[PDB]
Structure formats: structure tokens, C-alpha cells
Amino acid sequence: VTLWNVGVIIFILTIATAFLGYCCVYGQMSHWGATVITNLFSAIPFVGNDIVSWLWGGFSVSNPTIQRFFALHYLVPFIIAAMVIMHLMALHIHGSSNPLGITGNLDRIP
Amino acid sequence: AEVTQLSNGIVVATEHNPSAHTASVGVVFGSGAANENPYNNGVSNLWKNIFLSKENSAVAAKEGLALSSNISRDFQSYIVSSLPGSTDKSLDFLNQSFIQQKANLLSSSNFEATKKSVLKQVQDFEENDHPNRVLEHLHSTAFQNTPLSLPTRGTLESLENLVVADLESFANNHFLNSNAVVVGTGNIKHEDLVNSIESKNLSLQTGTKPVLKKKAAFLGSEVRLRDDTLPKAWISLAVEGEPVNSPNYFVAKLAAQIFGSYNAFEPASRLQGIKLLDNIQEYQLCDNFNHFSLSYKDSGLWGFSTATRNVTMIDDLIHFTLKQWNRLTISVTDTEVERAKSLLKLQLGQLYESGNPVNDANLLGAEVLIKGSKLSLGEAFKKIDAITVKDVKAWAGKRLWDQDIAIAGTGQIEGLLDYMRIRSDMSMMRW
Amino acid sequence: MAFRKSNVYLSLVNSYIIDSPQPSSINYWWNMGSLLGLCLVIQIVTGIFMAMHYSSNIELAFSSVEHIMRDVHNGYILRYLHANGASFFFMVMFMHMAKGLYYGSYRSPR
Amino acid sequence: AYTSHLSSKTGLHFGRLSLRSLTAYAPNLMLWGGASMLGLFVFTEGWPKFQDTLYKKIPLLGPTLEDHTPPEDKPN
Amino acid sequence: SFSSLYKTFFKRNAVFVGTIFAGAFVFQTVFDTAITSWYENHNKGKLWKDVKARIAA
Amino acid sequence: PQSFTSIARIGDYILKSPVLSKLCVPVANQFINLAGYKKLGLKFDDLIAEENPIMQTALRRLPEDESYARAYRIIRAHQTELTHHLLPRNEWIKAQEDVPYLLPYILEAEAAAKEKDELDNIEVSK
Amino acid sequence: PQSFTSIARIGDYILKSPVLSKLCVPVANQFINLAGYKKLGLKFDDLIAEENPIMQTALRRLPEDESYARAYRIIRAHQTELTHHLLPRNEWIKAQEDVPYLLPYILEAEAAAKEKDELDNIEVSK
Amino acid sequence: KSTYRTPNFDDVLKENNDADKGRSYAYFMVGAMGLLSSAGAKSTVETFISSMTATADVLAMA
Ligand code: HEM
Ligand code: HEM
Ligand code: HEM
Numbered sequence A: 001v002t003l004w005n006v007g008v009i010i011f012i013l014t015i016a017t018a019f020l021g022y023c024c025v026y027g028q029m030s031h032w033g034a035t036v037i038t039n040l041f042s043a044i045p046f047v048g049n050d051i052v053s054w055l056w057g058g059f060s061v062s063n064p065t066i067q068r069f070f071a072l073h074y075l076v077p078f079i080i081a082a083m084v085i086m087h088l089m090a091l092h093i094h095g096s097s098n099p100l101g102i103t104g105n106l107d108r109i110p
Numbered sequence B: 001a002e003v004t005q006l007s008n009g010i011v012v013a014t015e016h017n018p019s020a021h022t023a024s025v026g027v028v029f030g031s032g033a034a035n036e037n038p039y040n041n042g043v044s045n046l047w048k049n050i051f052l053s054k055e056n057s058a059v060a061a062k063e064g065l066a067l068s069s070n071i072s073r074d075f076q077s078y079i080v081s082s083l084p085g086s087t088d089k090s091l092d093f094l095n096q097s098f099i100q101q102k103a104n105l106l107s108s109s110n111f112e113a114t115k116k117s118v119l120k121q122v123q124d125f126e127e128n129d130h131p132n133r134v135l136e137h138l139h140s141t142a143f144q145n146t147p148l149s150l151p152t153r154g155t156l157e158s159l160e161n162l163v164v165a166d167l168e169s170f171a172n173n174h175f176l177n178s179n180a181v182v183v184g185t186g187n188i189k190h191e192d193l194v195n196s197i198e199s200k201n202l203s204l205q206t207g208t209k210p211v212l213k214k215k216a217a218f219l220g221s222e223v224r225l226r227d228d229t230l231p232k233a234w235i236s237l238a239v240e241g242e243p244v245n246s247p248n249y250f251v252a253k254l255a256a257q258i259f260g261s262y263n264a265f266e267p268a269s270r271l272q273g274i275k276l277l278d279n280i281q282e283y284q285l286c287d288n289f290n291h292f293s294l295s296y297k298d299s300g301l302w303g304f305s306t307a308t309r310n311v312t313m314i315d316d317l318i319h320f321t322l323k324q325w326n327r328l329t330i331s332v333t334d335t336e337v338e339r340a341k342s343l344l345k346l347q348l349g350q351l352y353e354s355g356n357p358v359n360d361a362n363l364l365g366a367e368v369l370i371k372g373s374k375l376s377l378g379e380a381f382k383k384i385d386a387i388t389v390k391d392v393k394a395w396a397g398k399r400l401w402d403q404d405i406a407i408a409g410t411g412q413i414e415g416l417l418d419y420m421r422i423r424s425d426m427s428m429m430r431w
Numbered sequence C: 001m002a003f004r005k006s007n008v009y010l011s012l013v014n015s016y017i018i019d020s021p022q023p024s025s026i027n028y029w030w031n032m033g034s035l036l037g038l039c040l041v042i043q044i045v046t047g048i049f050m051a052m053h054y055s056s057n058i059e060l061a062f063s064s065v066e067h068i069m070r071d072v073h074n075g076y077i078l079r080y081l082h083a084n085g086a087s088f089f090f091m092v093m094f095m096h097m098a099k100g101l102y103y104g105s106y107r108s109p110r
Numbered sequence D: 001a002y003t004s005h006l007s008s009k010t011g012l013h014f015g016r017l018s019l020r021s022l023t024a025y026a027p028n029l030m031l032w033g034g035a036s037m038l039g040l041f042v043f044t045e046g047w048p049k050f051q052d053t054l055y056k057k058i059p060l061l062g063p064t065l066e067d068h069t070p071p072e073d074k075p076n
Numbered sequence E: 001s002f003s004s005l006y007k008t009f010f011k012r013n014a015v016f017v018g019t020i021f022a023g024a025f026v027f028q029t030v031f032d033t034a035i036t037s038w039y040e041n042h043n044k045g046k047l048w049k050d051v052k053a054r055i056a057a
Numbered sequence F, G: 001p002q003s004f005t006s007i008a009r010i011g012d013y014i015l016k017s018p019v020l021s022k023l024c025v026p027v028a029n030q031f032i033n034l035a036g037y038k039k040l041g042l043k044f045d046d047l048i049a050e051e052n053p054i055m056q057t058a059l060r061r062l063p064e065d066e067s068y069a070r071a072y073r074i075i076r077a078h079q080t081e082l083t084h085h086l087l088p089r090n091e092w093i094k095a096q097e098d099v100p101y102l103l104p105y106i107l108e109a110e111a112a113a114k115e116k117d118e119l120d121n122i123e124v125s126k
Numbered sequence H: 001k002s003t004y005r006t007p008n009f010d011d012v013l014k015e016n017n018d019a020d021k022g023r024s025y026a027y028f029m030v031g032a033m034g035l036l037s038s039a040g041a042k043s044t045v046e047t048f049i050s051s052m053t054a055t056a057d058v059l060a061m062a
């Protein structure tokens, strides 16, 4: 169960990494896709509007936003590499499974 | 049932039992090992073996009498057992062999032979009896520099210096009428025993016993007698407990019953209703443990003793047992209190209601030298039944929660951690 | 056993900073290793937050550092922390290496 | 009278958790709730949205957070 | 009493932790105000507020 | 993670009902044939997941002759699947051989663990 | 890393020359006094690094009573250094007690190791 | 010397040994360290978060 849960964390971090790199091109889809995702957090009842201002660095998607999105797109991949090791550590406890769904302790190969 | 009279200074107490086939009489003194000093330690052990000497006990066998003697922290007793109807000879033997004439027993070649034998009794105790020599060092470290820290058997280094003149000093100071209780248990009537004593002189000395300057005080400490050649580890751990004359005397006793005793090699001991057992059984952490509650005149001790062969997981054993002590303050349940009530009443009814009049004489004489009377077994059952869960939590929060501890150990105890790591387990940060 | 010893991730924490058996005679010179760990954390965190306002073009590199000092809120604190922190990094490392040279920590087993 | 059997019931539970253990822990779990609100106020003190609705209405510690700079001294 | 002091603040960790947080909230506001007051008073006559009112005479 | 005590309780009610037995049992027989574990030389009781204390107790109390046979059927199934083939038709497990051999050991271990949980949460009346 | 066989070879030559024994020894006694290990309750043989295979056999073959005493002197020095103090002057190791108790067990283990190496590189004069 | 003779510890022991008094003294000093550490942590977190809000030149063009 713990190996499954670490994988869900890796999946979340990979979605964020791909989104951040797509904004670094600053095409028409890059700019307008960021103002419909970051504007989602404005729906929080209290201090929802203060969060988007802190995330934007200003009043809309502008120069502060693009420069900070590249710094984060550089960093998250190294966090992903750290959670892969934790992924392999939890697999090494009981080993992998097999397509038959039963124990594999009676026949093993290196 | 217990009847207590007074006569010119000595106290006579009896516990009559017609169904008994053996009567027992003797004298119990209200002074013990806690009334000596680090230089005469072992005097009361010599007086015990002089009473049971070969020449003294040969005289008693001809009349058909058997002798016994016990040495404790607060009291020492000298008992003579015989068939019913032979009680007159037992009183006569005690009078002319221990009470009024100690010169023949204290002769040379009889003191020099007894001293030779006792010096051997403590040499092998100090190197063969491990569980009982760490419980003695627990007293030594928890009451250091106070009277409640000297071993009852004495010290090897201290016993090589004792002479016959030291035994006469102790007898003159403690074997007195104001420090003595005359007891009779088994098949013997109260009227008959007191009549026999007055028909003779039967008077001890006249003076009063010296008073001790400082009282006993607990100190959190530890002593480590590490020995890597022994195959096991023996550990004792305790906090400050209750004195004999306390309102929380039965509440502390019931608290030790909740955790109880354990034997890993007994199939029925592994099925007890103790929540600690399911933590220490997946990996065999210990071979046995027992929870005690010892009471004295000044203070007491509350804790447990363990012996294990799993020397690499001692920390796990200590961590789990102390975490269950924490629940006595926060989350002890009603089922645990009801079970411990039933097991405490059975255990008390097996100690006071045994079939040995010698055991009864020690128990009855010691309880009169402290509070002047004996509490019956029927009244104690009414006090145990009245205990509630709120009583346990109040007592545990005062004596157990975040308190100092005393530790003693021997054997392979490298895996026993430092004092501060263990003391951190007396409370929880989650509460 | 305790949860700190049975868990896959906690057992690495327990074996390194909780239950690690240390000699009782080590003095304060054995404290520089833990300080170097704090220096590395300080440099990484201040560098990342400064990199959200920095431009690496040769025509804008100098002016972007001046922009951090003047326009970014608490930006001079980050810059002076990063510049002086790097000087303290080498101070501790020089003493860390001289400790092992004095006490023969380079010898056979290690 | 002679007793020949034990009368008992089973308490409500689900796994390691029981109703009796929940009741004992309930009063202490509210204090941990109040210790987390106090710790939340410490870290949001500089947030001006929380100042204007919560912290500035404290009798003695409130007014010391208000800024008293004249408009002629501000560029924005 | 010292027993009542321990029983109220030091027996439960929840109260101990909550007291630390509530003492840090009070310290935070008081420490700032007392520092600016001393700092401003040590530099009287050199601040913009001081010189602005002087030329306003 | 449904207990075998729960499965047996529901299953028996179907078998003792004459109406339900004639409509449900025929469906179950076709369900088992389509599952196709017999074509790999396995019984159903070999497919139960064993990484829990209940099934580790039951496998400990199984007699040696049964335990040796089970280990051969499991090894043979791993090698047959390795090759992406089936066993020859004459080596398939028959319906009369697919018997619940491990079920009585599982139920006995499950009843002991339930009684232990009901005694740890005991409440004494009066 | 310099073997005790080589150390003794140079030392024994010095101690048998009348001229050389007259100037080297007086400066060697002052060197030992300034070293200051005797003020912690230690002999020189307790300072030898023990993480090599040669010194592991020497400590194995040391008589039991001498091995118990060495463990006390090592534990005592760690506790004294922990307090940043010195031992009282009456507990210092004296000159007549600073003897090479472990030296014979090292020279014998080293001689055996040297003979093994010479026998793995043997060349028969064919 | 016997092992029941404890050494001298009187140069480090405190004359009055009260559990309630000596525990409240120790917890007041670990609670003071945790009070100042808690206030210094709020300062450190706020400094980094605040450097992301809006620079002075951006606010000028509001
Ligand atoms: C898991 C790892 C990564 C993923 C999934 C990822 C994903 C992406 C994606 C989807 C784009 C958009 C490209 C496009 O649409 O044309 C992009 C662009 C970019 N990425 Fe990454 N990235 C990763 C790692 C990195 C790293 C580590 C760096 C730099 C150190 C980096 C640097 C860049 C750059 C410079 C661009 C510029 C736009 C372009 O060249 O197309 N990426 N990334
Ligand atoms: C970021 C750089 C470094 C970090 C984080 C680091 C960390 C550590 C730590 C935590 C310790 C144990 C604690 C201590 O001994 O103080 C240690 C020990 C040691 N380090 Fe480093 N170190 C670093 C760089 C170096 C360098 C540059 C050298 C040598 C050139 C070195 C050599 C050693 C040695 C020999 C030891 C063991 C010394 C002993 O225990 O006696 N380290 N290191
Ligand atoms: C061990 C880690 C690091 C060390 C020793 C280090 C060292 C330095 C030094 C000495 C400077 C010159 C600053 C000056 O003289 O004013 C500098 C500048 C700089 N560093 Fe780092 N650095 C480290 C990590 C990082 C990281 C991880 C980043 C970004 C993710 C970063 C970003 C920057 C930036 C943007 C500058 C621009 C100049 C300035 O802001 O002062 N640094 N670094």
C-alpha cells in the first residue's frame, strides 16, 4: 500500500512539471492556459484572491510570472528524482508481484 | 480473631485456629537491617545463625521443637514450633536459650564456626543469585546514604571485622521489652499463652532503642554491574512507592496487579488479559517479569523486574512496558480495574490464609509492631472493592507521571540505554 | 519493535540521527559537519528565491542584481545572506578539513 | 449465593479503536485544537487581510499594528 | 503552590505548547513597538518627519 | 478482504434454498470454467492471497503431503505461464479434484481471531 | 604502518651503543613526559591503533586478567577527557608501570605473517 | 571496596529536592527557548514569502 501511495505523489509532481515548462514557451496557448489555471484558486472563499496575487507576482500573467515559472521548472525534476528512490525503497521490501497473483517465493531468477 | 493484650511492656498477640495440627510461639522485634550502620552491617545475620546453631538446635530437637528465624528491613523474628500441648516447653526453651542466657551460645569456637559459615553464604549469593542481587542494589542506589539502603544479609567486607563484642552491643540496644511482640499462632489460645508468660518472669531488657537521625529519602539514580560472561540480563526499575500506614496502600497494590507476572514457558501464562503481552510476544523480548509494590516504615518502591536473553532488543522491552504505565493516568479502563480486583483478593487470601503457622507469626507480629493492631481480611476486601477508576488515575498522576526513577542491572546490559532516554518514557508528548 | 525501527523510511532517520552510537569523548570540533549541512541548505534556499528575479543575459545580468537589492521586498537580505553565507561555507570547511588532519581521521579504516 | 457463570457484554469498537478510548481522549483532543489555532495566529500576523478582521480588534495589542503615515509621504 | 503551577501548565503537553504559542504572539507585537521607539528616539532630529515639520514653520 | 466466514454464510443460504440453487449454481459453474485456472493445473484454493497472518497460520497447520503437492502445482503454473502456453488437455484439473482443501483450516483460524477480539473488548455487567 | 619489527631493530641498535644510548634516551624520557598520556591513566601500549588484522590477534591472545585491566584504563580516560580535566596526581601512571605488556604478542604475530608471505613466493632451485 | 558503597556526589547535589519545584524550573527554560525559536521561525518564513508578492516597480504602475 505504501508503494502505491508514493507513486500517486510522483504523478502529481509530474503534472506540475509539465505545466510549468509549457508556460516557458509563452505562445498563445501558453499564455492563455495559465490565466485559466491560476484563476481557479480565486474561488477559495477567504484569502482566495490574495493567493493568486502572490502566485502571479503582480496583477496578471506578466514578466514576474514567467521568470519564476522557469525557476520552478528547473527544481521539481530533482524532487522527482528523490521520490523515485523512495519508490524503489518501498518496492524492495516484499519485491514485485507476478501476473498469476500468487506468491513468487518458490521460483526466482536474478 | 486477632486478640492483642499488653503486659508490663511486652505485647501478646494470637491468631487461634482449632483445625491446626501445630502451634507456634516466638518473639518479633521491631528493629531490622535498617537499624545498622555501614560498619556493623551483618550483625542481625550473625544473630540469626547463632540461634539456629548446631548445639542450640540439638537441644531443641530432643524435646521435639523446630526453630526458625527471619531478617527484614524493619523486623526480625525468632520462632519455635511444636505440637499442640507442648507449648509450655517452647516458651521455656526461648526463655533460657535466647532471652536470659546468651553466654553459652556466644562462646568461642561457636562464634568462630558460625562466622565461617555465614561468610560462605554471602560469597555465593554475590556471584550465583543474580535476580535477587539486582533487587538489593536497587535499594542501595535508590536510598543511598540513608538507613533504607543496607543489605539485609550484610556485606562481605563488613563481616570480616565483626567480633563477639559487637553482637552484645546490638542485643543490649534492641532486644528490649518496648521493641518486642510475643506471638502465638496455630492451635493455641490467647488465655493460655498470657497465663504461661506471667507464670514465669519472662522479661527482656529495660532500656529504649536509639532513634535514627535522618529518615529515608528517594533519589533518582542508577548502578550498572555489567558482566559480559553471564548469559542473560537482569534489570530492576522502580519509582518511589507508598509506606505501610498510607491511604493509597491498596491502590498502589492494585496498580501492580494490572500488569502482573509472566512466564514465557507456561502455556497458560501467555493467555492472560494483559495488554502488554501482545507487544512483547511477536518478538520474544523477555523470559519473565513481575510487578511489585514494596512498603516500609518510611517509604516504598513500585516497579518491575525482568530477565531476558534477547540482548539486542532490551530498549524495545523497556519502551513498551513504560508506555503501558502511562495509560494508568489517562486511559485505564473499567474492565482492567475489575479484573485486578479479583486477582488481588485471591493473592491476599493465599498469603494470610496459608497453612503455615510460621508464616502467620511473621505476618501478624510485624503488623502489630507498626500500627499496634492487625487489620482483618474481611475489612481489606471491603477496601479493595471500593476502588474506582478515578482513584487509579489520581494516584498514577501523582506517583508515576513524569517522575524520577531508579535502575539496577547486571549481565549483558550494553543494550540498556542511558538514564535520560529511559526517563523520557515516563510521559507522552501526544497528551 | 518500535515503529521508528520497523518503518522503511523512519529506520533511515533512526539509524542516522536518533540511535546512532557516538563516542562520549568527542569535543566541539566534531560539530563542524552538522554546520556544513546547514550552510548547504541556506545557499540552496536563498539561491532559488533569488533566481525568480534574475536574468542571465550579459546586457541584463548586472542590472538584475541591482533590481533585487532595490525593488524586491527583503531582497537585500537574500543577497547579503547568499554572498556572506558562501564566505562562511569555506570558513567551516577549512576548519572541518584541519580537524581530520590533526586527529588522523584519514587513516586506514576511513 | 453460588455463582456458576460470568455475565458480560462486548463494547462498541472498530479495530484498534473503541468508544471508551475515544471518550477518554476527547477532552484532550479539543485542547490540541485550541493549540493549533494559537499557532496559526502567530504565523499569519503579517498577513494584512487577517489583521483587518481579527488582530486589529484586540484591545491593547490591536492599535499597535495600525500604520500612521501621512498620505504626503507615500509615493503610491 | 508549585504543585498547582505544574498541574495547570506543565502536566499536559497540549497546554504547554499552547502557552508557548500564545506567549510568542504577545512577544511579537510588543518587541517590535519597543524597538522602533528606542531607535527613533536615539536619532531625534535626523528623520524625515522631524525635518519636514521644521520647514513647515 | 471479505472474511471467508462472511462468504460461507451467504453461500450456504443459496445452497439450502431449492429455488435459488437451481438459478445460481448453474451460473457459478460457467463462471469457473471461463476463469480458466484449471487449464494451468491449479485449484482455486491455490489462488488465495497469503500475505496476512490468517493465511500464514492456516498454511502452517496443513499436513506435509498436501503442502508438498501444493508447492508443485504452483511451480508448474509459473513455468507454464512463462512460455505463454497452456497445459496439455489431459493434465488439466478436473472438477471433482477442485475441492476446498484449505478452507477448514482458514475458518478455524478465523474463529479464533474473532473470539480474541471480543474478549479484549469485554465489559462485565452487574 | 611502520612495523614493530623495524621499530625494535632501530631501537635495539641504539640501546646497545654506549655513545648513542647516552644522548637519545635522556631526550626520549622528556619526550614521553611532555606527551602527557600518563596523566590520563594510560600506558603507551593502550594508544596503538587496533583496526588492523595483526593487532586483532594480539588482543585475542592477551591473558584474560591483563585484558580486563586495559578495558578499565580506556573507559577511565574517555570519562576524564569528557570533563576536560586531568586525573589526580596520585592516580597518574608511573615510569615503572609503563611497561610494554602487549609488545611480545605483536612481534610474534608479525613474524608469523612475514613467514607466510615468504612461503607464497617460494622458488624451488630447479 | 564494596559495590554497595556509593561514591560521593555531594558536590553536585541540590540541598532541596522538590519534584514540582525542580521540574517547573527546568520547563520554564525549555519553554523560553521554544518561545523565541517560534518567533524567529515566523520571521524567516515571512521574509521568503514576502519576496514573491509584487516588486516596487510593479506597484508603481498599478
Ligand atoms: C520530468 C522532467 C521534465 C518534464 C516533464 C518537462 C516538460 C517540459 C515541457 C512539456 C515543455 C514544453 C515544451 C514545448 O511544449 O515545446 C518544456 C520546456 C522546457 N523545459 Fe522541460 N521538462 C522537464 C525537465 C526539464 C529540466 C530539468 C530543464 C532544465 C534544467 C528543462 C528545461 C526546459 C526548457 C529550457 C524549456 C523551454 C521551452 C522549450 O525548449 O521547448 N526541462 N519542458
Ligand atoms: C558539504 C560538505 C561536507 C559535509 C556536509 C560533511 C559532513 C560531515 C559530517 C556530518 C561528519 C560527521 C560529524 C563530524 O565529524 O563533525 C563528517 C565527518 C568527516 N568528514 Fe565531512 N563533510 C563535508 C566535507 C568534507 C571534506 C571537504 C572533508 C575532507 C577533505 C571531509 C572529511 C571528513 C572526515 C575525515 C570525517 C570523519 C572525521 C572523524 O569522525 O574523525 N568532509 N563530515
Ligand atoms: C553550495 C551552494 C552555492 C554556493 C556556494 C553559491 C555561491 C555563490 C556566490 C559566491 C555567488 C556570488 C554572490 C556575490 O558575490 O554577490 C553566487 C551568486 C548567485 N547564486 Fe549561488 N551559490 C550556491 C547555490 C545557488 C543555487 C542553488 C542557486 C539557484 C538555484 C544560486 C543562485 C545564484 C544567483 C542567482 C546568484 C546571482 C548573484 C547574486 O544574487 O548575488 N546559487 N552564488
Ligand SMILES: COc1c(O)c(C)c(C/C=C(/C)CC/C=C(\C)CC/C=C(\C)CC/C=C(\C)CC/C=C(\C)CCC=C(C)C)c(O)c1OC
Pocket (backbone or CB within 6 Å): A075, C016, C017, C033, C034, C037, C038, C040, C041, C044, C045, C048
Ligand atoms: C545533527 O545531525 C545531522 C542532521 O540533522 C543533518 C540534517 C545533517 C546534514 C546532512 C545532510 C545529508 C544534508 C541534508 C540536505 C541536503 C542533501 C540538501 C538540502 C536540500 C534542499 C534544501 C532543497 C529544498 C528546496 C526547496 C524546498 C525549494 C524552496 C522553494 C519553494 C518552496 C518554492 C515556493 C513554492 C511555490 C508553489 C511558489 C547532518 O550532517 C547531521 O549530522 C550528522
